[PDB]
């Protein structure tokens, strides 16, 4: 579903992805209501979306 309204990838993808844990930086005891996403859109996803 993150790859449904926001970003999936190009189908013939070249290059790659690097990810790592970020609990220390992008988290607070009070909560971060700053990173938000999309739940509703009319149509289906296709590669570039912003």
């Amino acid at each position, epitope marked *: 579903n993150i790859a449904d309204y926001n970003y999936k990838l190009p189908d013939d993808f070249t290059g790659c992805v690097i990810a790592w844990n970020s*609990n*220390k930086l992008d988290s*607070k*005891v*009070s*909560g971060n209501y700053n990173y938000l996403y999309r739940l509703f859109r009319k149509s289906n996803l296709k590669p570039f979306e912003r």
Partner: antibody
Amino acid sequence: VQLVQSGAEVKKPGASVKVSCKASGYTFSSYYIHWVRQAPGQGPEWMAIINPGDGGASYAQKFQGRVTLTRDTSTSTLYMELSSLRSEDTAVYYCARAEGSSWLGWFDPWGQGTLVTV
Amino acid sequence: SVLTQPPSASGTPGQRVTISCSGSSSNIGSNYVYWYQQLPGTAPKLLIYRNNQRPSGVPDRFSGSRSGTSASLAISGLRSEDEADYYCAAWDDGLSGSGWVFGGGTKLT
């Protein structure tokens, strides 16, 4: 520059028990507050971490939702209202101090604790 | 995870023994450890930071170190006053909960 607890006694199981300790000393808005529970004859379990000011709260897996905490700045009181007491909920509570704006690091000295039994 | 600890730590006055906490992956090898000593009848007191320096000041007869997924504390010059219970605390970061987990329980004799 110290924290002292409040007095309590044995209560009926399946009820609400009010627990509190004061806070005084340095500035208040930039020091996180830890509470931790310790059972006799065993190891202590971490209870909660609280940000003053906005009163941010976070709870562990074994106590998520079944315990309620409140906090304030001017009166400087720190309340929990325990509910659903078992024989497992007979232990001593401690209120602490942290580094400040960070929940990782060494723990500043605790109080004298509050003993609760059912 | 669970932070297994030996049930007791044998000792005699005037010698050196090591007390250790053995943990799982991403609990000891990831974050630092904290050693604690509980004197009877008193509130617990901090004794070490991350095991490279002393917090305020203690004689250097106690030495802490890490090895892989475990942490160890070597104590020497044992006295009858220091007979207490030792605990270790660490940030767990496990599945469904990431609290400040503690060890088991040991007794110094």
